[PDB]
Amino acid sequence: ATLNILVRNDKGRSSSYEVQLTQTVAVLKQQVCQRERVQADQFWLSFEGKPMDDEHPLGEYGLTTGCTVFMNLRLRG
Amino acid sequence: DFLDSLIWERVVDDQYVTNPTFCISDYFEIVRQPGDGNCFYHSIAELFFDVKTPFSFRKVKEHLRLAADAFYDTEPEAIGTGVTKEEYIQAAMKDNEWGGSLEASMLSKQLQITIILWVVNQTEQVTAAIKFGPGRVSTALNLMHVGRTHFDALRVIN
């Protein structure tokens, strides 16, 4: 049972990602790296005010179809 | 006014994001900082203290050591990193060690101030801003992040 979620990127643009609730956040971060052409260590993901831990399955955050995960940049300078 | 009318999306706790598109120079004056690896702390020092010296950034890093000890273990940016509080502190305290959003989040809470990092492309156009703390733009400490490698300070034009 695959799921369609939105990820809001660092420009504020949202696009669809096909995920499984059983896959880890790290796998979703890999999908975001592929589309946004970024490295995994350059951002973290959040949902409904909670940071998403790489090793936990997406289901643990209550993702549903049409929900929006936020892409948050790790800034260093 | 324009800056205080932006819509902020809450990320976690007191961290917010917004993605307007405007030229940073139309609303801010840029206060340029050296490219010595300490520009983040220079930029904070430029706006937080009344007197600016080439070593004021060290007083900011002293507050960072107090901030990290009290907030690092609960920082949302520091999840899935596997780096303990002690490993981060002495590594972040080295001279010329870069800082940024993680340090802004903890310093915001330690100093009870609002800090905003404005992400700017090469056209000096804003692409994103991250606000740490509950305050408004006109009262916040506004920094400019350019080239994904440098920080300058910003002052709100009137």
Author numbering:
A (entry chain B): 80 to 156
B (entry chain A): 2 to 159
Article, verbatim:
Beyond the RNA-dependent RNA polymerase (RdRp), the L protein contains a viral homologue of the ovarian tumor domain protease (OTU) at the N-terminus. This OTU reverses posttranslational modifications by ubiquitin (Ub) and interferon (IFN) stimulated gene product 15 (ISG15). Sheep ISG15 was derivatized into a suicide inhibitor with propargylamine and incubated with KUPEV and GANV OTUs to form covalent complexes that could be used for X-ray crystallography. This yielded an atomic resolution structure of KUPEV OTU bound to the C-terminal domain of sheep ISG15 (C-sheep ISG15) solved to 2.06 Å and a low-resolution structure of GANV OTU bound to full length sheep ISG15 to 3.15 Å.
Examination of the high resolution KUPEV and low resolution GANV OTU-sheep ISG15 structures reveals them to possess the familiar overall mode of OTU-substrate binding, in which the OTU binds to the C-terminal domain of ISG15 by a mix of hydrophobic and electrostatic interactions. On the sheep ISG15 side, the interface with the OTUs is formed by W123, P130, and F149. One of the most noteworthy interactions is that of sheep ISG15 D89 forming water-mediated interactions with both KUPEV OTU T128 and R149. Interestingly, this results in D89 pointing away from the interface, contrasting with previous observations for this residue position in OTU-Ub structures and CCHFV OTU-human ISG15 structures. Considering the selectivity pocket in KUPEV is lined by hydrophobic residues V18, V120, A129, and I131, the adoption of a more solvent-exposed confirmation of the charged aspartate in sheep ISG15 is understandable. For instance, the OTUs from KUPEV and DUGV have limited activity for human proISG15, but efficiently cleave sheep and cow proISG15s and show moderate activity towards camel and vesper bat proISG15s. In the KUPEV OTU residue 122 is an asparagine residue, while CCHFV is unique among OTUs with an alanine at this position. As anticipated, the GANV OTU E122N mutant reduced activity for human ISG15-AMC almost 10-fold, while KUPEV OTU N122E boosted activity more than 6-fold relative to WT. In KUPEV OTU this residue is an isoleucine, creating the potential for a steric clash with the longer glutamate in human ISG15 compared to aspartate in sheep ISG15. In contrast, the KUPEV helix mutant (I80R/G81L/T82V) demonstrates a 5-fold increase in human ISG15-AMC activity while reducing Ub-AMC activity by half.
